[PDB]
Ligand binder design. Structure first.
Ligand SMILES: O=S(=O)(O)O[C@@H]1[C@H](O[C@H]2O[C@@H]3CO[C@@H]([C@H]3O)[C@H]2O)[C@@H](O)[C@H](O[C@@H]2[C@@H]3OC[C@H]2O[C@H](O[C@@H]2[C@@H](O)[C@H](O[C@@H]4[C@@H]5OC[C@H]4O[C@H](O[C@@H]4[C@@H](O)[C@H](O)O[C@H](CO)[C@@H]4O)[C@@H]5O)O[C@H](CO)[C@@H]2OS(=O)(=O)O)[C@@H]3O)O[C@@H]1CO
Length: 282
């Protein structure tokens, strides 16, 4: 059996790793809401993000069970869907009003932040046309989407094995700012050999000032390594490196309406997180 004190990919502890306890959770107890924000709890919304239409985050769809954090996607047409903070009952996406209806998901966000570390999540994505995501934000700095999975994609088997990885700039001073370029600074489709919804797997993201590396079930996936020297072209384009920020960690599920929408028969579905281990260098 592997030693849980160290990253599955670094069992000899070459990294001299120490668990960051305020960012980590084995989810063996009821969810600690002094450690984790259930999005919407007491009307608190990280990033003022109530959900991606048609879905909305529900405080009842996040809880621990059987040793796992559960992010639950439900068909709940009678849910009391709220307005966005801007007053709208819809998102506007590619010219279309997409109304909030039918589906509730959840988002769980760390109440603490950290900068740099080995992030290891053991999880099974929701088996429906819904995302299961593991990501970060910092306040008007940037966002790393370690993965967006879509475990129950009905028509694209590649998506069933995909971790969509993104880096997004939230800094209006940055030429790669999301509301300037309307897209990520960097994106790649991490493809693993097994359906993300089929079983639990261990995903590792080693985040440093100079690189980000991806690990699957303890093994480096070198095809997906991100180097600061490459993204910035040897520091000639430094604004392309935006991940030197303190981050909150998010787990959530969302409808991506243009990718797919679940049927009632697909639901409920669960994005199950057996644990999150975040280590930092001693
Ligand atoms: O339009 S204005 O220029 O006027 O600006 C308005 C507003 O001004 C107005 O407010 C009043 C209404 O009219 C008057 C006012 O009476 C105007 O002055 C500004 O105040 C407002 O300012 C915001 C706040 O400070 C900057 C603004 O945005 C900040 O929040 C950011 C969040 O919007 C952003 O949220 C995203 C969101 O949840 C996390 C973010 O990503 C998520 O999507 C991800 C996706 O990117 C990824 O690929 O996949 C993920 C998983 O699937 C997920 O889908 C959601 O889209 O997060 C940012 C992080 O830095 C900021 O959040 S925060 O950390 O700073 O809290 C502040 O709310 O801006 C208005 C115009 O927007």
């Amino acid at each position: 059996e592997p030693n849980p004190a160290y990253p599955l990919s670094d069992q000899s502890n070459e990294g001299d790793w120490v668990l960051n306890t305020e960012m980590s959770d084995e989810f063996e107890l009821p969810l600690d809401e002094d450690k984790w924000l259930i999005q919407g709890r007491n009307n608190e919304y990280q990033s003022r993000f109530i959900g991606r239409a048609p879905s909305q985050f529900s405080v009842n769809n996040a809880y621990t069970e059987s040793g796992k954090l559960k992010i639950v996607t439900k068909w709940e047409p009678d849910y009391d869907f709220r307005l966005k903070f801007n007053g709208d009952d819809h998102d506007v996406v590619n010219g279309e009003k997409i109304y909030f209806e039918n589906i509730t998901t959840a988002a769980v966000i760390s109440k603490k932040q950290f900068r740099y570390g080995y992030m290891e999540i053991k999880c099974k994505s929701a088996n429906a046309p819904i995302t299961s995501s593991f990501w970060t934000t910092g306040k008007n700095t940037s966002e790393m989407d370690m993965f967006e999975m879509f475990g129950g994609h009905k028509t694209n088997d590649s998506w069933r094995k995909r971790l969509k990885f993104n880096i997004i700039s939230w800094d209006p001073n940055n030429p790669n700012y999301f509301n300037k370029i309307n897209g990520p600074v960097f994106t790649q489709n991490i493809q693993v050999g097994n359906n993300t919804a089929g079983d639990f797997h261990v995903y590792g993201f080693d985040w440093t000032a100079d690189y980000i590396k991806v690990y699957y079930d303890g093994v480096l996936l070198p095809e997906y390594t991100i180097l600061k020297s490459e993204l910035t072209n040897n520091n000639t384009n430094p604004d392309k490196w935006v991940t030197d920020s303190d981050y909150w960690i998010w787990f959530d599920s969302e409808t991506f309406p243009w990718l797919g929408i679940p049927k009632e028969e697909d639901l409920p579905a669960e994005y199950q997180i057996e644990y999150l281990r975040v280590w930092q260098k001693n």
